């Protein structure tokens, strides 16, 4: 076959239900993540080629960067509640891994204050139970795929992208081949 089962993605021996259509999973300390958003733009290519009636989400993880890591992924949770993701993906990037000027909660909340979030309104949802819920929610959906390596794509908690397993000679082939996966393995 053209798409196979171990070379451009790999099943779940235990799949997952109810799980979301299309979920990615990244860290902010995550250098192939850093491509991924920056100079790949990933998750918007598999959009503009997923069918109509598909949900996408995106989720941040604490197994890297440790006490930061945690604060990224309440961080992650603030963004989605308040639906500034866009606003705050790249200077969050930057801060982390290219001028490392993001060392602790409060040079994380400077980004979001920069992007333009109200110091009270950041600091109303940072403590807020909607925003606890949301960790919670990231952290479940990393444990039930036993995830421990990002960046990761799974669709309908079934198959999981294998990047590893497309040409890389060329970055808009593949990226291209990534989404048209993604959309093949969404149409399965």
């Known amino acids: 076959a053209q798409y196979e089962d171990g070379k451009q993605y790999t099943t779940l021996e235990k799949p997952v239900a109810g799980a979301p259509q299309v979920l ?4 902010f300390f995550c250098p192939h993540c850093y491509q991924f958003e920056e100079v790949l733009h990933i ?18 993880v604490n197994f890297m960067g440790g006490d930061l890591g945690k604060d990224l992924t309440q961080a992650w949770a603030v963004a989605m509640a308040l639906g500034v993701e866009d606003k705050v993906t790249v200077p969050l990037f930057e801060g982390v891994q290219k001028t490392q000027t993001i060392r602790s909660a409060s040079d994380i909340r400077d980004v979001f204050i920069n992007a333009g979030i109200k110091g009270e309104e950041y600091d109303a949802a940072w403590n807020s139970f909607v925003v606890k819920s ?7 959906a ?7 390596g990002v960046p990761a794509m799974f669709v309908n908690g079934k198959y999981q ?3 590893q397993g497309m040409d ?12 048209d ?8």
Request: charged share 25%; aromatic share 10%; net charge positive.
């Open 161 to 163: 992208l294998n990047p």
């Open 24 to 27: 990615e999973f990244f860290s």
């Open 181 to 188: 996966t993604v959309k093949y393995l969404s149409e399965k």
């Open 134 to 140: 949301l960790v919670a929610q990231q952290e479940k």
């Open 168 to 179: 890389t000679s060329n970055m808009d082939v593949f990226v291209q081949q990534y989404a």
């Open 43 to 60: 998750s918007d290519n598999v959009k503009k080629k997923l069918p109509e009636g598909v949900k996408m989400t995106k989720y941040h």
């Open 142 to 148: 990393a444990a039930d795929v036993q995830l421990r």
